[PDB]
Curated annotation (Swiss-Prot), chain A:
Higher taxonomy: Eukaryota, Metazoa, Chordata, Craniata, Vertebrata
Compartments reported by the entry: Secreted, Extracellular space, Extracellular matrix, Basement membrane
Residues linked to a glycan: 29
Subunit structure: Interacts with FBLN1. Interacts with LGALS3BP. Interacts with PLXDC1. Interacts with SVEP1.
Name this protein carries in UniProt: Nidogen-1
Keyword Transmembrane helix appears in the UniProt entry: no
Native species: Mus musculus
One Gene Ontology CC term in the entry: extracellular matrix
From Swiss-Prot, chain B:
Subunit text: Has a strong tendency to aggregate in dimers or stellate structures. Interacts with other basement membrane components such as laminin, prolargin and collagen type IV. Interacts with COL13A1. Interacts with FGFBP1. Interacts with VWA1. Interacts (via C-terminus) with ECM1 (via C-terminus). Interacts with SVEP1.
Domain of life: Eukaryota
Function of the molecule: Integral component of basement membranes. Component of the glomerular basement membrane (GBM), responsible for the fixed negative electrostatic membrane charge, and which provides a barrier which is both size- and charge-selective. It serves as an attachment substrate for cells. Plays essential roles in vascularization. Critical for normal heart development and for regulating the vascular response to injury. Also required for avascular cartilage development.
Span covered, complete protein: 1769 to 1857 of 3707
Name of the featured protein: Basement membrane-specific heparan sulfate proteoglycan core protein
Organism: Mus musculus
Length: 273, 89
């Protein structure tokens, strides 16, 4: 009951008792799932570590990195997520350029909410597990991604731990990548959200005299998002079975000098159109 | 932990229809840091605005675009801010 476990709720939330138990709910002008809440229109930061074991192209020896930092910035209701990942080796930096979804999950979490639809943070409170896989059509193997989000920590930071393992095609040193606007469908069912999407991306050759023509490639993203929802509050409206994420203004960049990988994108969440 | 610098031409004046660009950079004691532009008080950028890697580009400027813009530098340790101003003829 609340009298016993009010501390389980966010300080910016209200507690309510029910037959089988209690549930938390963010107060007016705050968004979240009750256990975690943030003020509307406020800037938020996400921090965590990144470790990987990635085979590039046809290499039989993987590039390994641990203790790499991930820092992301967003402003509630603006819809744009900016992610930086640094201490990323040049040996893998360019080949990770097409993987904007590494930071894209943060865009899903804070997408601009339209009509009667909720973004990732409203649904999970930033407490969830993301299992993702990506297959590059025409190339061997696949890349597996696992990310754990643990809510807002003692410092006020949202949290995210990232693990990457597998094989990705080789992208020429100094090349750049372009991704056009797209939409993704997120299906909900009993505390589980899934999505699968096949998209294309363009690779532009190294910016030097004689740069050859650009070329496109295709990959398929598959992901499963798991989390907990309060099992009480019978009079609780069910979440939509399907929500559409609209993505645009995508930018990806890798800088060899500072060895930093950057991803940026704009997001809106609403009905299927 | 982090220091922001709005590159020269912090104050610009253009006519309606032009494109304007503002640049932001920073010195950080941490490897991973971000640079993000917004209007004053964390106001939402115009739809015609593009913002990435510290570079803010506003295309086909409208009188309503006039005002102060803020570049926010951030890392796991702290944040810092610098400003720029736009005037429309
Ligand atoms: Zn922290």
């Amino acid at each position: 009951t609340c009298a016993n476990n009010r501390h389980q709720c966010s300080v910016h939330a209200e507690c309510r008792d029910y037959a089988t138990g209690f549930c938390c709910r963010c107060v007016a002008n705050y968004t979240g799932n009750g256990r975690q809440c943030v003020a509307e229109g406020s800037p938020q930061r996400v921090n965590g570590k990144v470790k990987g074991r990635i085979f590039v192209g046809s290499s039989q020896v993987p590039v390994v990195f641990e203790n790499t930092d991930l820092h992301s910035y967003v402003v509630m209701n603006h819809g744009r997520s900016y992610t930086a990942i640094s201490t990323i080796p040049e040996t893998v930096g360019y080949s990770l350029l097409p993987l904007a979804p590494i930071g894209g999950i943060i865009g899903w979490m804070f997408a601009v909410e339209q009509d009667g639809f909720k973004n990732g943070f409203s649904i999970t409170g930033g407490e969830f597990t993301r299992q993702a896989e990506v297959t590059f059509l025409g190339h061997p193997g696949k890349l597996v991604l696992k990310q754990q989000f643990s809510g807002i920590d003692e410092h006020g930071h949202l949290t995210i731990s990232t693990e990457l393992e597998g094989r990705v095609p080789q992208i020429p040193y100094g090349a750049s990548v372009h991704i056009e606007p797209y939409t993704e469908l997120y299906h909900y069912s009993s505390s589980v959200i899934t999505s699968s999407s096949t998209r294309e991306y363009t690779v532009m050759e190294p910016d030097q005299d004689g740069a050859a023509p650009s070329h496109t490639h295709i990959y398929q993203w598959r992901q499963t998002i798991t989390f907990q929802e309060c099992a009480h509050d019978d009079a609780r409206p069910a979440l939509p079975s399907t929500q559409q994420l609209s993505v645009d203004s995508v930018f990806v960049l890798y800088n060899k000098e500072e060895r930093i990988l950057r991803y940026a994108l704009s997001n809106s969440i609403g009905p299927v159109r | 932990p982090i220091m922001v610098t709005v590159e020269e031409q912090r104050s610009q004046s253009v006519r309606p229809g032009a494109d304007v660009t503002f640049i932001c950079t920073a010195k950080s004691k941490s490897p991973a840091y971000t640079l993000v532009w917004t209007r004053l008080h964390n106001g939402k950028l115009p739809s015609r605005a593009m913002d990435f890697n510290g570079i803010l580009t506003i295309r086909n400027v409208q009188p309503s675009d006039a005002g102060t813009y803020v570049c926010t530098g951030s890392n796991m340790f702290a944040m810092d801010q610098g400003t720029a101003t736009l005037h429309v003829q």
